[PDB]
Design a protein around this ligand. Structure first.
Ligand code: CLA
Ligand code: CLA
Ligand code: CLA
Ligand code: CLA
Ligand code: CLA
Ligand code: CLA
Ligand code: CLA
Ligand code: CLA
Ligand SMILES: CCCCCCCCCCCCCCCC(=O)OC[C@H](COP(=O)(O)OC[C@@H](O)CO)OC(=O)CCCCCCCCCCCCCCC
Ligand SMILES: CCCCCCCCCCCCCCCC(=O)OC[C@H](COP(=O)(O)OC[C@@H](O)CO)OC(=O)CCCCCCCCCCCCCCC
Ligand code: SF4
Lengths: 41, 208, 740, 83, 77, 209
C-alpha cells in the first residue's frame, strides 16, 4: 500500500481528485439549485 | 510415447525463475492426467444410463441422452429431479470449488493441505512428490499400487485408458451434435448397417 | 526450429516504479529540475528504443502495449454495445428505420442539455448518432437489447482477459527474442488463423444467424415474432423454409454440389431494394471465399516441417540487373527493426482504411445505411482521416528507422542503399511533378475564377465551355457497367451503382444512384493527385534525408527528433525528419479536407436526395457541375450555401454542433501562436513571470521553462489538426443531420 | 461423393497422383526442398513405416493439395459444361 | 457581493499555494514535491486557508510576504 | 502456525496473528502501514458492531411480525415509523448527526491519541472514556467487566470479530434476498425450511434468468 499510495499522491491527486471533486460539486449546485443570475440569497 | 510433433515438453520453454506459465512439463502432465480422469468419468456417465436403459436394468424414464439431462437445456432438461438444475449447479460450484482449490493449493505447496485443519481429514490430504499422484489413506485407500513395477504398469494403463477416453468424449460430443441421439444408438446404427450409418451418410443428413 | 521460448518472471509486479514517474530513462530518473522534464516524461514514455538497447525487452514492451490497446478497444466496443442496450431507440429503429433517426447517446438534464436530447422519433429523445451502429446491428442478426447487453458483457470480459494477458505476457511469462523473430510462424498464424478463421467464423454466423433474421426483417415481419438465432441454429426445419438448400443438410458441400447452395450463397450485383444495402448472401459467400483464400495463403511459409517458403530465400532470390543486389538485407532489417515493420504496417493499414472508406461509400454493406446519409458521410470521412494519419505515421516511423535502426554494414548494394544513393534524383523529379500538378490543377481553377470574374464564361475549363472530359474514368465506368454482360456472366448486376443505370431508393430517399463525372470531377481528382504527390514528396524527403544531406552531413548523429542545427548555413531550422513529418501532417490535412469536401458536395449534388414521381431531386440542385470549376464557386456554393444550419442550430437539437464548430475555430486559431512564434520570446516572458512570482515568494521549486522548439511545433500541429478536424466534423454533421 | 460418380473418380485420381508423385521425387515434399527445379533431397523427422521421406506432415500436405486440385478440377468442369 | 465571493476563493487558492510553496522549499531536494504531492499537509493547508486575507495582511505587514530584490533574479538589461 | 483463510497459503507480513480474527486474508495489501492498520482495525470493529446491532434489530422485528405483532418489514420500516413518530424527519437525523458527531469525534481523537479523552475534560471522567486497546475502549463501556482476564478477553475478541463478520454477511444477505424475494428474512428462512429441495436462490424468478 505504501508503494501504491506513493503513486496515488502524484498527478491524479491534483489532476483527478481535485477535478472530480470541484466538477461534481459544481454539478450538484447547478442541479439542486436552478440557474441563478442575481445573488439575492 | 514420443508423440510430440508441435513441441511443448521442452525444458527450454518457460525457463528462468518464479512460478511461470502453463506450458511446462509438470503442469502439462498434471492437466493430462486430470483431463484423462475427467474424460473417463464423463465417458462412463454418458453411456452408462443408455446401456442400462436398453437392457432395462434402471428405469428407462430416467435413462436419457447425456446432453438432455440438463447440461444443455436447449437439447433437453430432466424435470423429475429432486432439485432444479441451478440448485444442483450451486451445490456443484461450492463442492468442486472446495475440491479444486484444495488441489491447486497443494499443487503450489506440496503437502500443505495436511497442516491446516479440515474436519480431521488432513491424514488423507498429504500427497506425494508428484502432485498428480497424491495417494494416501483415501486417494489410494486400497493399497493396490504398492510395488514400483506394477505401479508404473498401472500408470501406463491409466494414461492409456484416459487417452482413449479423450477420443471417446470427443466422439460423444461430435455424434451428439451430428445425429442428436445417444452414442449407443450410434453404435447400434453402425452395427446394423455400417455403410448406411457412418460419417459419410450422417454428414449429409438432418441436424448435421 | 520454431518453438515457444519464454522467460518466466523477468519483472516483479509492484508499484515501486509507479512511485517514481521518471524511471524508463536515465536522464529522467534524476528529477524534475525544469518544467520540460514533464513534457519529456510524457513524450519519451513509450519510446522504448532509448529506454534500453536490448531488443528482447523492447519486444516484450510492445507486445504488452498491443495487449493494452486491444483491451482499451474492447472496453470501448463493449461501452458502445452497452449504450445501444440501455440508452438507445434500437428497438424502435428496427420497426421503422426509414423514419426514426438512430440515437445511442443520452445526455443529462443538468444544465440546458435537454435541448440536445432531440426528437429522434419512436418516443425517444437523445443525440442522433452517426457511427452507423444501428445498421451494423441490423446486418448481424440482433433484435433485442438483451443481446446487446450480452455482447457488452462479453466485450468487457474479453477486455479484462486482454489486460490480464498483457500483464502475464510481460511481468509473468515474457517471450524471448527468438519467439518474436519467428516471422514465418507469425505470418502463417495471422494469415490462416486470425484473418482466415475470423472470416470463416463470420461467414458461419452470417449463414446460420444473419441471413434468416435479415430475410425475415425485410419481408415485413416484426422483430418481436422473429425467431431467435439459436432456433435457426438448432432446428433445420425453420432454416429450411427460408432456404431450401438447408434441407439437404451439408450433403452438397462434401459432394461438390455447391451450385445447390445458390439461394443463400448468391452472386448478385447491386443492393437489396428493400433495405438499400448489400445482399447478405453475397456477403456470406464473400467471407467464405475470403476464409478459403486466407486459409490457403496461411500455409505458404516454412516453420517446422520442411515444406513451405523461406522469406529470406525469396528475398535473396529476386535480383534483377538494374537493381544490383535485390532484397538482400531486407529480411535482416525487418527481423531486427520494430520501426521498419511499424512503417510498412502503418502504410498498408492507412491505405486499406482509405480503401475501406471508398468501398463503403460506393457499396453500402449494411441495411438502411445508404439512405442514412449522415452515417455514410461520417464513416467515409472518419476512415479517410484515420488512413491519412496512419500513412503520415508510417512516414514518421520509416524516418525513425532510417535514423536509428539503419546500419550501412549489412547493406552495400541492395535496393535500400541504391535508394539512398539516387535520392536527389527522386526528390527532384517528385518536386518537378508536384509543381507541374500544382500548376495544371490549380491554375486551371484560378483561370476559371478569372474568366468568371472577367465576364467570359465561354473561356472556362467547364462543360459548357471547352472541357477536360475524364475519358479514362468514364471508360472504366462503362466497362464495369458492361462487366456482368460479358466478363462476369454469372453476376446478376453491376458490382456497384456508381456506374450503373438504376436508381435504388428506400423510404423515398435515394440509396445509391449513378454518378456522372465531368470537367469539375477531373479538376478535383487531379487536385487530389497533386496534393497526395506533394505530401508524399515531403514525407519521402524527410525519410531519405534523415540520415545525411548535402547541407548537414552528420544529421544521423543529431538523432531523429532534434529542433535544428543552429542558424548556420543560413539557418537549418526544421531540418530534422520529425519536422518533415510535422509539415506532412498539415499537407495530409489539406489533402483529406479537399477530398471530403469533394465527397460531401458530390454526394449532396448528384447522389443523395429525395426521389419523386416526376424525376429525382437531389439535396442541392446539381450545383457541382456548374459551380465546382472555380474556387469562389466552391466557396459560395459549398461552404456558404451549406453551413447555414450550423449557425442557425441554436435553440435546437444541433446547437452542440455549433458550439463544437466555434470551439474548433478557437482551437485551430489558437494553434498559430505555437506555429509562428519561437521559444526565446516565450522564455523571456516566462522569465518576467518568474520575477513576478519571485517578488512575493511564490516561486515554484521546479523552474518554469518555455516549451521546446520540437515541443512547440508538436503542440501547434496538434492544436491545428484538432481544430480543423473538429471544424469539418461539426459542419459536416450539422449539415447532414439538419438536411439529410 | 457417391462411389462411381465422376467427381469421386476425379478427386480419387487427383489425391492418388499427388501422393504418388511425392513418393518418388516429382514434388517438393518434406525431403525434397524446392529450388526453381526442386532438388537436393534432404531428410528430417522419420517416415514411420514405408520408405522415402513421407511422414504425417507429408501425407497431410499432399492430401490437402490433392483435395484442392480435385475440387478446382470438378468445379471447373462443372462450369465449362462437363460433369 | 459575488466579486468578493470570487476574490475570497481566489485568495484562498493563492494562499494555500503559497503556503505549500514555502513549506516545500524548506525540504531537501524540494523539486520532487511538485510532482510528488503530499496529501496530509496539502489538506491541512487546504482547511487552514479560510482566513487567507488576515494571513496575507499580516505577512505583508511583517515583510515575509515579499522578498528583497537583492535576492531576486534580475534581468541584466 | 494458525488457521488461514486459504489452507497452505502464505499470510501477509503485516498480519502476524496479533489481531482478533487474524486469518491472514489481505490480497489488496490494505492496512500495511501501522497507522492505516489501526484505522482499518477501528473501521472493522465499528462496522462490525453496527452490523450486529442492525441485524439483531432486523431479526427481532421480523420475528415479532411473524408472531403477530404489528411490526413492519426490515425494509421501509422508517417510512411508516415517521408517520407515528413524534419526532419529524430532519430534526431526527440532525439530532442523530450532532450526537454522533460528539461521540465519533471523541473516539477518533482517542484513536489518534490513546487516553486523550480520559483526562477528565468531559464531566470529570478519568478511568472511563480512556481506551484500552486499538479499537476496544474500557471503563464506562465495560460495566460487567468480563474483559479483565486476558484469556477471556482474547476469546471474547475473537468471538466478537467472528460474529461481526457473520453480521456483515448477514446484512448483505438481507438486502440481497429482500431484493430477490420482497419478503422478510424470517419468511425466507421459513420458506427454506418448509421446502428446501425447491425453494432456494434459483427458483425466485429474479437473479437467475
Ligand atoms: C465456423 C463456422 C460454422 C459453424 C460453427 C457451423 C455450425 C453448424 N452448421 Mg454450418 N456452415 C458453415 C459454417 C459453420 N457452420 C458454412 C461456411 C457453410 C457453407 C454454406 C455451412 C453450411 C451448413 C448447412 C447446409 C447446414 C449446417 C449445419 C450446421 C450445424 C450442424 C453441425 C454440423 O453439421 O457439424 C457438427 C459435427 C461435428 C463433428 C462437430 C463436433 C463438435 C462437437 C460439439 C465437439 C464436442 C466435443 C466435446 C469436447 C465433448 C463434449 C463436451 C461435454 C462435456 C459438454 C452447426 C450448428 C446444419 C444445420 O443447420 O443443422 C441444424 C445444416 O444443415 N451448416
Ligand atoms: C463534487 C461535487 C459533488 C457534490 C457536492 C455532491 C453532493 C451530493 N450528491 Mg453527488 N455526485 C457527484 C459529485 C458531487 N456530489 C459525482 C461526481 C457524481 C457522479 C458519480 C454524483 C452522483 C450522484 C448521485 C447519483 C446522487 C448524488 C446525490 C448527492 C447528494 C446526497 C449525498 C449526501 O448526502 O452528501 C452530503 C450532502 C450534503 C449537502 C449530495 C448533495 C444524491 C442525490 O440526488 O441526493 C439525494 C444521488 O442520488 N450524487
Ligand atoms: C492462429 C493463431 C493466432 C491468432 C489468432 C493471433 C491473433 C493475434 N495476434 Mg498473434 N501470434 C501468433 C498466433 C496468433 N495470433 C503466433 C504463433 C505468434 C508468434 C510467432 C504471434 C505473435 C504476435 C505478436 C508479436 C503480436 C501478435 C498480435 C496479435 C493480434 C493482432 C491484433 C489484431 O489483428 O486484432 C484482432 C483482435 C482481436 C480478434 C481481439 C481478440 C483477441 C483474442 C483474445 C486473442 C485470441 C487469439 C489467441 C492466439 C488465442 C490463444 C491464446 C491462449 C494462450 C489463450 C491478434 C489478436 C499483436 C498483439 O500483441 O495483440 C495481441 C502483436 O503485436 N501476434
Ligand atoms: C501503429 C501505431 C503506432 C505506434 C505503435 C507508434 C509508436 C511510436 N511512435 Mg508513432 N505515430 C503514429 C502511430 C504509431 N506510433 C501515427 C499514426 C503518427 C502520426 C500522427 C505517429 C507519429 C509519430 C511521431 C511524429 C513520433 C512518433 C513516436 C513514436 C514512439 C513513441 C510515441 C510516444 O511515446 O508518444 C507519447 C504519447 C503521447 C504524446 C500521447 C499522444 C497525445 C497527442 C499528442 C494528442 C492526442 C489528442 C487526441 C487525439 C484528442 C484529445 C483531445 C484533448 C482535448 C483531450 C513509438 C515508437 C516518436 C518517437 O520518438 O519515435 C521513436 C515521434 O517522434 N510517432
Ligand atoms: C493554400 C496555401 C498555400 C499555397 C498556395 C502554397 C504554395 C506552395 N507551397 Mg506550401 N504550404 C502551406 C501553404 C501553401 N503553400 C503551408 C501553410 C505550409 C506549412 C505546412 C506549407 C508547406 C509546404 C511544403 C512542405 C511544401 C510546400 C510547397 C509549396 C509549393 C507547391 C507548388 C505547387 O505544386 O503549386 C503550384 C503553385 C501554386 C499553387 C502557387 C500559385 C500559382 C498560381 C496558380 C498563379 C500561377 C502563376 C501566375 C500566373 C504567375 C503570376 C505572375 C505575376 C508575378 C506577374 C508552392 C510554392 C512544396 C514545394 O516546394 O513545391 C512542391 C513543398 O515541398 N509548402
Ligand atoms: C506408393 C505406395 C505407398 C504408399 C502410399 C505408402 C504409404 C504408407 N505406408 Mg508404405 N510401403 C510401400 C509403399 C507405399 N507406402 C512399399 C513399396 C513398402 C515395402 C513393401 C511399404 C512398407 C510399409 C510398412 C512396413 C509400413 C508402411 C507404412 C505406411 C504409412 C506411413 C505413414 C504412417 O502410417 O506413419 C503410409 C500410409 C507404415 C504404416 O502404415 O504404419 C502402420 C508401416 O508400418 N509401408
Ligand atoms: C481441369 C481443368 C480446369 C478447368 C477447365 C477450369 C475451368 C474454370 N475454373 Mg478452375 N481450377 C482448376 C482447374 C480447372 N478449372 C484447378 C486445378 C484449380 C485449383 C488451383 C482451379 C481453381 C479455380 C478457382 C479458384 C476459380 C476457378 C474458376 C474457373 C473458371 C475460369 C474460366 C472463366 O470463368 O473464364 C475466364 C475468367 C477470367 C477472369 C479471365 C482471366 C483474366 C485474367 C484475370 C487477366 C472456369 C469455369 C473461377 C470460377 O469460379 O469461374 C466461374 C474461380 O474462381 N478455378
Ligand atoms: C498557487 C500558486 C500561484 C500563485 C500564488 C500565483 C500568483 C501570481 N501569478 Mg502565477 N501561475 C501559477 C501559480 C501561481 N501564481 C501557475 C501554476 C501557472 C502556470 C499556469 C502560473 C502562470 C502565471 C502567468 C502566466 C502569470 C501569472 C501571474 C501571477 C500574478 C497574478 C495573480 C494571478 O491570479 O495570476 C493569474 C494566475 C494564473 C492564471 C495561474 C492559474 C493556475 C492555477 C490557479 C494555479 C494552481 C496552483 C495550485 C492550486 C497550488 C497547489 C495548492 C497546494 C495546497 C497543493 C501573481 C503574482 C501574472 C503576473 O505576472 O502578474 C504579476 C502572469 O502573467 N502566473
Ligand atoms: C515514375 C517512376 C519511374 C522510376 C524508374 C526507375 C525504377 C527503378 C528501376 O530502375 O528498377 C529496375 C527494374 C529492373 O531491375 P531488376 O529487374 O534487376 O530488379 C528486380 C529486383 O528489384 C527484384 O525495372 C523496373 O522496375 C521497371 C519498372 C519501372 C517503373
Ligand atoms: C475538518 C475537515 C476534515 C479535514 C481533514 C484533514 C485535516 C488535516 C490533516 C492533518 O494533518 O491534521 C493534523 C492536524 C490536527 O489538528 P489539531 O489536532 O491541532 O486539531 C485542530 C483541528 O484539526 C480540529 O479539526 O491538523 C491541522 O493542524 C489542520 C487543521 C485545519 C483546521 C480544521 C478545523 C477548523 C475548521 C474551520 C472551518 C470553518 C472556517 C471558517 C473561516 C475560514
Ligand atoms: S530559429 Fe529556432 S529552429 Fe531556426 S535555426 Fe534558430 S534556433 Fe534553430
Amino acid at each position: 500500500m505504501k508503494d501504491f499510495t506513493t503513486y496515488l499522491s502524484t498527478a491524479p491527486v491534483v489532476g483527478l481528485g481535485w477535478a472530480i471533486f470541484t466538477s461534481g460539486l459544481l454539478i450538484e449546485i447547478n442541479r439542486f439549485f436552478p440557474d441563478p443570475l442575481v445573488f439575492s440569497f | 510415447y514420443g508423440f510430440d510433433p508441435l513441441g511443448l515438453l521442452d525444458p527450454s520453454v518457460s525457463g528462468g525463475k518464479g512460478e511461470g506459465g502453463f506450458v511446462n512439463p509438470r503442469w502439462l502432465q498434471y492437466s493430462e492426467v486430470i483431463h484423462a480422469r475427467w474424460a473417463m468419468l464423463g465417458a462412463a456417465g454418458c453411456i452408462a444410463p443408455e446401456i442400462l436403459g436398453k437392457a432395462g436394468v434402471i428405469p428407462a424414464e430416467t435413462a436419457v441422452d447425456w446432453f438432455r439431462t440438463g447440461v444443455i437445456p436447449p437439447a433437453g432438461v430432466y424435470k423429475n429431479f429432486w432439485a432444479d438444475p441451478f440448485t444442483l449447479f450451486f451445490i456443484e460450484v461450492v463442492a468442486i470449488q472446495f475440491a479444486e482449490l484444495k488441489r491447486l493449493q497443494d499443487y503450489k505447496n506440496p503437502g500443505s493441505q495436511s497442516r491446516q485443519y479440515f474436519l480431521g481429514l488432513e491424514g488423507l490430504f498429504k500427497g506425494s512428490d508428484n502432485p498428480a499422484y497424491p495417494g494416501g489413506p483415501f486417494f489410494n485407500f486400497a493399497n493396490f499400487g504398492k510395488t514400483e513395477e506394477e505401479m508404473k504398469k498401472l500408470k501406463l494403463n491409466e494414461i492409456k485408458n484416459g487417452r482413449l477416453a479423450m477420443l471417446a468424449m470427443f466422439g460423444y460430443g461430435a455424434q451428439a451434435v451430428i445425429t442428436g441421439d445417444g452414442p449407443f444408438d450410434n453404435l447400434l446404427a453402425h452395427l446394423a448397417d455400417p455403410t448406411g450409418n457412418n460419417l459419410i451418410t450422417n454428414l449429409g443428413g438432418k441436424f448435421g | 526450429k520454431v518453438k515457444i521460448a519464454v522467460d518466466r518472471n523477468p519483472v516483479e509486479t509492484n508499484f515501486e516504479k509507479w512511485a517514481k514517474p521518471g524511471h524508463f530513462s536515465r536522464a529522467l530518473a534524476k528529477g524534475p529540475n525544469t518544467t520540460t522534464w514533464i513534457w519529456n516524461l510524457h513524450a519519451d514514455a513509450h519510446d522504448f528504443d532509448n529506454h534500453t538497447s536490448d531488443l528482447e525487452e523492447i519486444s516484450r514492451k510492445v507486445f504488452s502495449a498491443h495487449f493494452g490497446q486491444l483491451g482499451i478497444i474492447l472496453i470501448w466496443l463493449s461501452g458502445m454495445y452497452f449504450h445501444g442496450a440501455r440508452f438507445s431507440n434500437y428497438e424502435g429503429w428496427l420497426s421503422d428505420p426509414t423514419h426514426i433517426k438512430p440515437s445511442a447517446q443520452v445526455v443529462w438534464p443538468i444544465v440546458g442539455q435537454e435541448i440536445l436530447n432531440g426528437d429522434v422519433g419512436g418516443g425517444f429523445q437523445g443525440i442522433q448518432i452517426t457511427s452507423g451502429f444501428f445498421q451494423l446491428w441490423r446486418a448481424s442478426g440482433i433484435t433485442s437489447e438483451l443481446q446487446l447487453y450480452s455482447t457488452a458483457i462479453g466485450g468487457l470480459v474479453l477486455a479484462a482477459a486482454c489486460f490480464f494477458a498483457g500483464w502475464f505476457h510481460y511481468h509473468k511469462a515474457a517471450p524471448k527474442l527468438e519467439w518474436f523473430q519467428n516471422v514465418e510462424s507469425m505470418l502463417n498464424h495471422h494469415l490462416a488463423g486470425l484473418l482466415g478463421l475470423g472470416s470463416l467464423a463470420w461467414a458461419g454466423h452470417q449463414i446460420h444467424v444473419s441471413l434468416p433474421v435479415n430475410k425475415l426483417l425485410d419481408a415485413g415481419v416484426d422483430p418481436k415474432e422473429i425467431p431467435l438465432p439459436h432456433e435457426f441454429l438448432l432446428n433445420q426445419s425453420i432454416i429450411a423454409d427460408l432456404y431450401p438448400s438447408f434441407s439437404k443438410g451439408l450433403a452438397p458441400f462434401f459432394t461438390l454440389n455447391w451450385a445447390e447452395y445458390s439461394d443463400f450463397l448468391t452472386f448478385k450485383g447491386g443492393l437489396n431494394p428493400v433495405t438499400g444495402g448489400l445482399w447478405l448472401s453475397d456477403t456470406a459467400h464473400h467471407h467464405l471465399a475470403i476464409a478459403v483464400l486466407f486459409l490457403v495463403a496461411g500455409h505458404q511459409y516454412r516453420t517446422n516441417w520442411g515444406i513451405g517458403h523461406s522469406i529470406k530465400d525469396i528475398l535473396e532470390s529476386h535480383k534483377g540487373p538494374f537493381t544490383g543486389n535485390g532484397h538482400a538485407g531486407l529480411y535482416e532489417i525487418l527481423t531486427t527493426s520494430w520501426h521498419a515493420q511499424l512503417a510498412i504496417n502503418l502504410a498498408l493499414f492507412g491505405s486499406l482504411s482509405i480503401i475501406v472508406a471508398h468501398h463503403m461509400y460506393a457499396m453500402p454493406p449494411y441495411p438502411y445505411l445508404a439512405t442514412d446519409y449522415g452515417t455514410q458521410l461520417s464513416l467515409f470521412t472518419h476512415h479517410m482521416w484515420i488512413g491519412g494519419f496512419c500513412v503520415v505515421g508510417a512516414g514518421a516511423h520509416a524516418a525513425i528507422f532510417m535514423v536509428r535502426d539503419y546500419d550501412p554494414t549489412n547493406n552495400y548494394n541492395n535496393l535500400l542503399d541504391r535508394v539512398i544513393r539516387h535520392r536527389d534524383a527522386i526528390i527532384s523529379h517528385l518536386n518537378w511533378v508536384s509543381i507541374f500538378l500544382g500548376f495544371h490543377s490549380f491554375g486551371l481553377y484560378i483561370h476559371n475564377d478569372t474568366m468568371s470574374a472577367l465576364g467570359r464564361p465561354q473561356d472556362m475549363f467547364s462543360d459548357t465551355a471547352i472541357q477536360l472530359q475524364p475519358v479514362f474514368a468514364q471508360w472504366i465506368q462503362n466497362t464495369h457497367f458492361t462487366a456482368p454482360q460479358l466478363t462476369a456472366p454469372n453476376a446478376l448486376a453491376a458490382t456497384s451503382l456508381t456506374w450503373g443505370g438504376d436508381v435504388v431508393a428506400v423510404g423515398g430517399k435515394v440509396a445509391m444512384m449513378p454518378i456522372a463525372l465531368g470537367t469539375s470531377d477531373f479538376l478535383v481528382h487531379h487536385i487530389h493527385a497533386f496534393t497526395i504527390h506533394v505530401t508524399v514528396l515531403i514525407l519521402l524527403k524527410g525519410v531519405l534525408f534523415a540520415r545525411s544531406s548535402r547541407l548537414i552531413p552528420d544529421k544521423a548523429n543529431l538523432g531523429f527528433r532534434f529542433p535544428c542545427d543552429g542558424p548556420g548555413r543560413g539557418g537549418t531550422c526544421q531540418v530534422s525528419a520529425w519536422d518533415h513529418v510535422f509539415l506532412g501532417l498539415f499537407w495530409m490535412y489539406n489533402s483529406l479536407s479537399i477530398v471530403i469536401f469533394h465527397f460531401s458536395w458530390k454526394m449532396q449534388s448528384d447522389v443523395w436526395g429525395t426521389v419523386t414521381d416526376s424525376g429525382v431531386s437531389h439535396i442541392t440542385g446539381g450545383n457541382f457541375a456548374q459551380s465546382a470549376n472555380t474556387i469562389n464557386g466552391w466557396l459560395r456554393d459549398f461552404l456558404w450555401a451549406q453551413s447555414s444550419q450550423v449557425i442557425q442550430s441554436y435553440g435546437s437539437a444541433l446547437s452542440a454542433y455549433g458550439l463544437m464548430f466555434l470551439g474548433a475555430h478557437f482551437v485551430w486559431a489558437f494553434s498559430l501562436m505555437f506555429l509562428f512564434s519561437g521559444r526565446g520570446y516565450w522564455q523571456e516572458l516566462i522569465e518576467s513571470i518568474v520575477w513576478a512570482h519571485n517578488k512575493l515568494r511564490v516561486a515554484p521549486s521546479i523552474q518554469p521553462r518555455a516549451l521546446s522548439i520540437t515541443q512547440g511545433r508538436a503542440v501547434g500541429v496538434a492544436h491545428y489538426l484538432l481544430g480543423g478536424i473538429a471544424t469539418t466534423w461539426s459542419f459536416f454533421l450539422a449539415r447532414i443531420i439538419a438536411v439529410g | 461423393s457417391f462411389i462411381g460418380s465422376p467427381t469421386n473418380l476425379i478427386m480419387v485420381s487427383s489425391i492418388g497422383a499427388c501422393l504418388f508423385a511425392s513418393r518418388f521425387g516429382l514434388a517438393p515434399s518434406v525431403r525434397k526442398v524446392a529450388q526453381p527445379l526442386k532438388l537436393s533431397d534432404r531428410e528430417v523427422l522419420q517416415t514411420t513405416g514405408d520408405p522415402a521421406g513421407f511422414t504425417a506432415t507429408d501425407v497431410l500436405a499432399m492430401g490437402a493439395a490433392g483435395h484442392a486440385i480435385g475440387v478446382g478440377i470438378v468445379l471447373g468442369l462443372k462450369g465449362i459444361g462437363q460433369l | 457581493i459575488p466579486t468578493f465571493g470570487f476574490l475570497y476563493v481566489a485568495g484562498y487558492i493563492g494562499h494555500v499555494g503559497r503556503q505549500y510553496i514555502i513549506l516545500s522549499k524548506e525540504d531537501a531536494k524540494p523539486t520532487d514535491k511538485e510532482i510528488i504531492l503530499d496529501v496530509p499537509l496539502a489538506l491541512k493547508l487546504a482547511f487552514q486557508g479560510w482566513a487567507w486575507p488576515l494571513a496575507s495582511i499580516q505577512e505583508l505587514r511583517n515583510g515575509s510576504l515579499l522578498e528583497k530584490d537583492e535576492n531576486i533574479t534580475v534581468s541584466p538589461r | 502456525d494458525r488457521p488461514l483463510w486459504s489452507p497452505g497459503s502464505e499470510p501477509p507480513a503485516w498480519l502476524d496473528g496479533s489481531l482478533a480474527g487474524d486469518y491472514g486474508f489481505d490480497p489488496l495489501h490494505l492496512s500495511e502501514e501501522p497507522e492505516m492498520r489501526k484505522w482499518m482495525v477501528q473501521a472493522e470493529l465499528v462496522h462490525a458492531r453496527w452490523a450486529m446491532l442492525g441485524v439483531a434489530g432486523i431479526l427481532f422485528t421480523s420475528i415479532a411480525a411473524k408472531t403477530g405483532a404489528p411490526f413492519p418489514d426490515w425494509y421501509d420500516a422508517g417510512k411508516e415509523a415517521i408517520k407515528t413518530s413524534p419526532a419529524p424527519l430532519g430534526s431526527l437525523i440532525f439530532t442523530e448527526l450532532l450526537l454522533f458527531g460528539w461521540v465519533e469525534t471523541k473516539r477518533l481523537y482517542d484513536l489518534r491519541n490513546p487516553g486523550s479523552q480520559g483526562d477528565g475534560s468531559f464531566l470529570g471522567i478519568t478511568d472511563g472514556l480512556k481506551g484500552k486497546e486499538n479499537g476496544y475502549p474500557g471503563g464506562l463501556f465495560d460495566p460487567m467487566g468480563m474483559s479483565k482476564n486476558e484469556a477471556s478477553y482474547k476469546e471474547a475478541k475473537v468471538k466478537e470479530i467472528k460474529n461481526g463478520r457473520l453480521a456483515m454477511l448477514a446484512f448483505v444477505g438481507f438486502i440481497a434476498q429482500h431484493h430477490a424475494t420482497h419478503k422478510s428474512p424470517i419468511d425466507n428462512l421459513l420458506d427454506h425450511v418448509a421446502d428446501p429441495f425447491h425453494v432456494t436462490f434459483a427458483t425466485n424468478g429474479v437473479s437467475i434468468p
